[PDB]
Amino acid sequence: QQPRPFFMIFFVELWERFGYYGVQGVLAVFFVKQLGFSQEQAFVTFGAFAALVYGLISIGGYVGDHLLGTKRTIVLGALVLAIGYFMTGMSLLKPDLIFIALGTIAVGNGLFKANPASLLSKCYPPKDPRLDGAFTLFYMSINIGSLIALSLAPVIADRFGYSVTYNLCGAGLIIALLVYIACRGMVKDIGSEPDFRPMSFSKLLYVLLGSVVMIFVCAWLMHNVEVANLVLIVLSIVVTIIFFRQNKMFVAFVLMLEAVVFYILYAQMPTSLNFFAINNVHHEILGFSINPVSFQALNPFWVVLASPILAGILSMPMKFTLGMFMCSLGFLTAAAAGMWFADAQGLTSPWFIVLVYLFQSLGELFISALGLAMIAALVMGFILGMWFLTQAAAFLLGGYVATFTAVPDNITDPLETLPVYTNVFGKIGLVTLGVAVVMLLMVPWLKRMIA
Amino acid sequence: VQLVESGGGLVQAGGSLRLSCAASGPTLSNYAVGWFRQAPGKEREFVAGINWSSGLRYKDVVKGRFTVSRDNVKDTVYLQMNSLKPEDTAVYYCAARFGGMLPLQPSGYANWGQGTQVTVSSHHHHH
Ligand SMILES: CCCCCCCCCCCCO[C@@H]1O[C@H](CO)[C@@H](O[C@H]2O[C@H](CO)[C@@H](O)[C@H](O)[C@H]2O)[C@H](O)[C@H]1O
Ligand SMILES: CCCCCCCCCCCC
Ligand SMILES: CCCCCCCCCC
Ligand SMILES: CCCCCCCC
Ligand SMILES: CCCCCC
Incomplete structure (x- = not known):
């Protein structure tokens, strides 16, 4: 049904994302248990880490386009990522390695992420209809990888420990690298223009030097968030000031403010929503005992189901507004499950958490898929810069928001934590409901401006 | 998933x-590991427990007398x-629930030891 290179790209993507989510799903619990952070520290640090993971993507896109090539940067990024995962394994012996390891992962991701998408959209002539299908299939592969990692990574960590987990993440990166290399043949005429000239060692050296400077800067930032806050505040206010000095770009700015809200919301799945599942939800479903951390796998799961369906089934400000409403509903459902359908002992049905994740995934299916690709139809380099900037700012802010649900180590009564989760979740759901209402109000104006 | 209790007896x-x-x-x-006890004719009741980061919880009637502790080695x-x-x-x-909470009812706990008899007799030395 699809070209031969499609399936290569599909599986390299699956394994890379398997490693990444194998880390994300266990990271905050790792900060709390293994490094003895308090939940407030773990949440803000996870914030900084995601912020860099998503802020650095722009760079990898540019390095693949104009310095090194696309297939080269896929190899380079996979190698730096495997090194990061193995470093994180080695952090258990050497704890002071942890931040450096995370920085490596961030930089590794920043170099790698944008390229396979580029590679994929060159396996097809410019108007081949199959494109859309492949893209959704591409998304599904990401989510299959995510689905598997979040399912098994915590189980593995509990029965064998964080070193074995992280090394499995590495091993998955190595598997992706071997697939790509053993299929170099299939991509012999595919790539960007630097993939067919010989490799400039000058540029390669600059990319290595800068990668390493960026690794040490990531590590400095995740250990000292207080200054990461200021770095991104100044960078953001200044890039909006040079956006406000310099009609479709204004609709892009409104769409980015809403995407920022949606990313603040997405940031909760690995932190506060995770700890809500740990603390106030039954750890059994259909009679099976499950590790509560595995509940995060519910996000990719619904995506994997609903994206075919929803790909089989207005336009831009409308779909954005729809997604906003969906996320609003996810948090109102969480708060309501806490406030009214709890046991005498403060525990709640995991079916309520399944519904939360369904609402969240639908919101993702609208906002995340559309906004990035269609901010590009509204448009440019400066706005990807600012788009990744503000998404990173969103993750920082999400971590700060998570801290409102943080629980001291000595609390052991679900009935004492339950009111805290429901107060924060209700307030979140209500604020984003107001936001989606204003969005709806502004929808027709924006549609006229887009035309 | 499977806990081994030990230490019971007549005292x-x-x-x-x-x-x-x-x-x-x-x-x-x-x-979190909770200790429940079921007396003859009654339902399992929460005695005492310790969570994954050393928070402690106790039933009223055992405070002062029962101590929970954890050897992580x-x-x-x-x-x-x-x-x-x-x-x-x-x-x-004993029962184990992942994480930092210690709920009071046996339904908050999925992994369970086999049980151990404890008998305490009114026996006193003769005066
Ligand atoms: C809702 C999403 C659920 C994701 C799917 C879960 C992954 C499948 C488990 C891997 C194979 C089963 O292996 C094992 O089975 C038992 C009962 O099933 C589970 O339960 C046992 O382990 C986990 C963590 O190790 C404990 O939190 C749990 O209370 C314990 O009883 C675990 O899930 C898994 O360690
Ligand atoms: C495919 C050709 C292999 C090129 C590998 C070059 C490695 C240079 C490392 C420089 C050290 C910083
Ligand atoms: C005293 C512990 C310090 C650990 C630093 C480890 C660096 C390893 C680099 C590969
Ligand atoms: C496609 C060839 C990749 C060369 C980069 C290797 C970096 C050590
Ligand atoms: C652009 C909104 C930033 C909010 C920071 C407190």
Whole structure:
């Protein structure tokens, strides 16, 4: 049904994302248990880490386009990522390695992420209809990888420990690298223009030097968030000031403010929503005992189901507004499950958490898929810069928001934590409901401006 | 998933037993461990427990007398019972729930030891 290179790209993507989510799903619990952070520290640090993971993507896109090539940067990024995962394994012996390891992962991701998408959209002539299908299939592969990692990574960590987990993440990166290399043949005429000239060692050296400077800067930032806050505040206010000095770009700015809200919301799945599942939800479903951390796998799961369906089934400000409403509903459902359908002992049905994740995934299916690709139809380099900037700012802010649900180590009564989760979740759901209402109000104006 | 209880016995009032809960596959470090007891004719009731980061919880009637503690090296959880009274006579279960919470009812806990008999007799020396 699809070209031969499609399936290569599909599986390299699956394994890379398997490693990444194998880390994300266990990271905050790792900060709390293994490094003895308090939940407030773990949440803000996870914030900084995601912020860099998503802020650095722009760079990898540019390095693949104009310095090194696309297939080269896929190899380079996979190698730096495997090194990061193995470093994180080695952090258990050497704890002071942890931040450096995370920085490596961030930089590794920043170099790698944008390229396979580029590679994929060159396996097809410019108007081949199959494109859309492949893209959704591409998304599904990401989510299959995510689905598997979040399912098994915590189980593995509990029965064998964080070193074995992280090394499995590495091993998955190595598997992706071997697939790509053993299929170099299939991509012999595919790539960007630097993939067919010989490799400039000058540029390669600059990319290595800068990668390493960026690794040490990531590590400095995740250990000292207080200054990461200021770095991104100044960078953001200044890039909006040079956006406000310099009609479709204004609709892009409104769409980015809403995407920022949606990313603040997405940031909760690995932190506060995770700890809500740990603390106030039954750890059994259909009679099976499950590790509560595995509940995060519910996000990719619904995506994997609903994206075919929803790909089989207005336009831009409308779909954005729809997604906003969906996320609003996810948090109102969480708060309501806490406030009214709890046991005498403060525990709640995991079916309520399944519904939360369904609402969240639908919101993702609208906002995340559309906004990035269609901010590009509204448009440019400066706005990807600012788009990744503000998404990173969103993750920082999400971590700060998570801290409102943080629980001291000595609390052991679900009935004492339950009111805290429901107060924060209700307030979140209500604020984003107001936001989606204003969005709806502004929808027709924006549609006229887009035309 | 599977806990091994140990330490039960017959003791005289004012005496002392120590129960112990260890686990097989998983590490008990990621678990709150509660000790429940079922007295003849009654339902399982929460005695005492310790969460994954050393938070403690106790039933009123055992405060002062029962101490919960955790050896993370040996991967074991201990319950010291001093000043035992005849109403402490029961089957004692340990239960493990992942994380930092210690709910009060047996339904908040998915992994369960086999039980151990504790009997405390009114036996006193003759005056
Ligand atoms: C809702 C999404 C659920 C994701 C799917 C879960 C992954 C499948 C488990 C891997 C194979 C089963 O292996 C094992 O089975 C038992 C019962 O099933 C589970 O339960 C056991 O382990 C986990 C963590 O190790 C404990 O939190 C749990 O209370 C314990 O009893 C675990 O899930 C898994 O360690
Ligand atoms: C495919 C050709 C292999 C090129 C590898 C060059 C490695 C240079 C490392 C420089 C050290 C900083
Ligand atoms: C005293 C512990 C310090 C650990 C630093 C480890 C660096 C390893 C680089 C590969
Ligand atoms: C496609 C060839 C990749 C060369 C980069 C290797 C970096 C050590
Ligand atoms: C652009 C909104 C930033 C909010 C920071 C407190």
